[PDB]
């Protein structure tokens, strides 16, 4: 487009809800769990009752594919092009695109597997710095290749990640956090703090098998002014991320399950009390897993009908 600026906002986006509903439809039509426990609890006069919907649960292959959203006739989607984008505010170079770029709808807490990268440098996005309750999204500029697999106790899986590349990536991350925090403060990394098992650990899906990998060996450095192995444990009792309720799955597939992936992003949370600052990994809300890649798209409706005053005739 021409010399035009547009007020972009990603924390009040509408395409994130369409993504979220479409992907809940995909998981409710694809993965059939064995036993579901959804608290119904329909009425200080409240009464809580739980359903026991049981279905046959076979094993199915599962790997993500790219998805391109496109606007219908009469609507267009605008794409921002600023490399150092704050996430909100004015984008001063916007283009009109027909269909958005390729997105892989992956489930991931504590990390952003298989995502899309940044252009120039590692970028930091948030709803509000110094709010202590909003998830900080970090997008990398180089992918950290992680191999993460179950060798031929069936529930034992190792997960190798390179050490020097992760140290350089964390150095880039702490250098970028030092812009917002006075350039002289000590930054610390902890493992987690309580919660359910799919938030305190890196929880994802690989080959149709659920993975709950500990991340205490990755966030352990404190910054001032050869290969890490992670003990992944395959679980069967899970909490669904669709709604509130527990789920039963099958025993895992006999054989070898292999999947390599590119770590491209991160979800952090500040622990600010009353000095040094401690960033601990978080996640769990999958709208944060799609606001970090649909961060530069905005749907808009053309209205090709205007009025203007002239010196015209009858």
């Amino acid at each position, epitope marked *: 487009l021409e010399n035009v600026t547009e007020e972009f906002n990603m924390w009040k986006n509408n395409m994130v809800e369409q993504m979220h509903t479409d992907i809940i439809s995909l998981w409710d039509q694809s993965l059939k769990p*064995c*036993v579901k*426990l959804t608290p119904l609890c329909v009425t200080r006069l409240i009464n809580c009752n739980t359903s*026991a919907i*049981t*279905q*046959a*649960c076979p094993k199915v292959s599962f790997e993500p594919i790219p998805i391109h959203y496109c606007a219908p006739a009469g609507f267009a989607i605008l794409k921002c092009k600023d490399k150092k984008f704050n996430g909100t505010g004015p984008c001063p170079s916007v283009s009109t695109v027909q269909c958005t770029h390729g997105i892989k709808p992956v489930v991931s807490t504590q990390l952003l597997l298989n995502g899309s990268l940044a252009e120039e440098e590692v970028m930091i996005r948030s709803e509000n710095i110094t709010n202590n309750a909003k998830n900080i999204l970090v997008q990398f500029n180089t992918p950290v290749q992680i191999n993460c697999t179950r060798p031929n106790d069936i*529930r034992q899986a190792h997960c190798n990640v390179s050490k020097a590349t992760w140290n350089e990536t964390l150095g880039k991350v702490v250098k970028q956090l030092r812009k917002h925090f006075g350039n002289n403060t000590i930054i610390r990394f902890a493992n987690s703090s309580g919660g359910d*098992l799919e938030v305190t650990t890196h929880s994802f899906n690989c080959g149709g098998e659920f993975f*709950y990998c500990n991340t205490s060996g990755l966030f352990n450095s404190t910054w001032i002014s050869d290969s890490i192995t992670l003990p992944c*444990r395959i*679980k*069967q*009792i*899970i909490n669904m991320w669709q709604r509130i309720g*527990q789920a*039963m799955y*099958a*025993p895992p597939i006999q054989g070898v399950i292999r999947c390599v992936s590119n770590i491209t992003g991160l979800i952090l949370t500040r622990d600010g009390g009353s000095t040094t600052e401690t960033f601990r990994p978080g996640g769990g809300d999958m709208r944060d897993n799609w606001r970090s890649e649909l961060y530069k798209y905005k749907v808009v409706k053309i209205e090709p009908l205007g009025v203007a005053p002239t010196r015209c005739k009858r």
Partner: antibody, heavy 126, light 106 residues
Framework: EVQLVESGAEVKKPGSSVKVSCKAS????????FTWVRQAPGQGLEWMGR????????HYAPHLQGRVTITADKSTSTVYLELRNLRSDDTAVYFC?????????????????????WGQGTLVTV | DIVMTQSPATLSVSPGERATLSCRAS??????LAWYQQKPGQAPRLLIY???TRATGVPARFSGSGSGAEFTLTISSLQSEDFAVYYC???????????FGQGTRL
């Protein structure tokens, strides 16, 4: 390993409700899945019900569906059977039984259908 | 809807003789089969779970094998304490409709 103790023998008139208790001891109670099984005198074994403890979910056979409720008490670590509308076929011996499946606290589960640990048997006459 | 009948209903062999007890199904139940023995006046005891794996505290002469709707349990050296009634139970289906064998006498 655990040990299972059943209740005493009971004589019930038809049309009543019979309540059978089975107490397990030796390990943590919720790390097991239990099963109530019937044996008529001189006949073979008949599967009746299976309860999963950490979900408190009970599945039953379609032979007598709608006639039993199998409950679990994690406080007393006991599994309970309730048969209402009993008729003369169930003059038999009931067995409670349990099977291990791993670390059910953290999320591990195995769908074990075999029956390893057994009780001693409760005789009932209709 | 599962039906369960096995064809060697009654068997009688001399002690010290290898014996085969067969387990028949109407369709393939894969490998989810359990072999049990029961002395009269006592609770049943597990011998084989998974149709090819031995249990804990069992004699090594028991050997289960087969697949689909075809299973055989063989015993090598018959002893005096093995005079019991034997059962095979399948647990292949979810949601669980389970049933036992009718019970063969040694």
């Amino acid at each position: 390993e655990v040990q299972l103790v059943e209740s005493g023998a009971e004589v019930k008139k038809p049309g009543s409700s019979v309540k059978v208790s089975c107490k397990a001891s030796g390990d943590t109670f919720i790390r097991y899945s239990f099963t109530w099984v019937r044996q008529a005198p001189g006949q073979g074994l008949e599967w009746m019900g299976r309860i999963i403890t950490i979900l408190d979910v009970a599945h039953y056979a379609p032979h007598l569906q709608g006639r039993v409720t199998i409950t679990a008490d994690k406080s007393t670590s006991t599994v309970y059977l309730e048969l209402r509308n009993l008729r003369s076929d169930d003059t038999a011996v009931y067995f409670c039984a349990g099977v291990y499946e791993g670390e059910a606290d953290e999320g591990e589960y195995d769908n074990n259908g075999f029956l390893k640990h057994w009780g001693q048997g409760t005789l009932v006459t209709v | 809807d599962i039906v369960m009948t096995q064809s060697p209903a009654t068997l009688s062999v001399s002690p010290g003789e290898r014996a085969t007890l067969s387990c028949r199904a109407s369709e393939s139940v894969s490998s989810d089969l359990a072999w049990y023995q029961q002395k009269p006046g006592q609770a049943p005891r597990l011998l084989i779970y998974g149709a090819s794996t031995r249990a804990t505290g069992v004699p090594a002469r028991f050997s289960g094998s087969g697949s689909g709707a075809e299973f055989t349990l063989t015993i090598s050296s018959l002893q005096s304490e093995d005079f019991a009634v034997y059962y095979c139970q399948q647990y292949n289906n979810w949601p669980p409709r389970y049933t036992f064998g009718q019970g063969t006498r040694l």
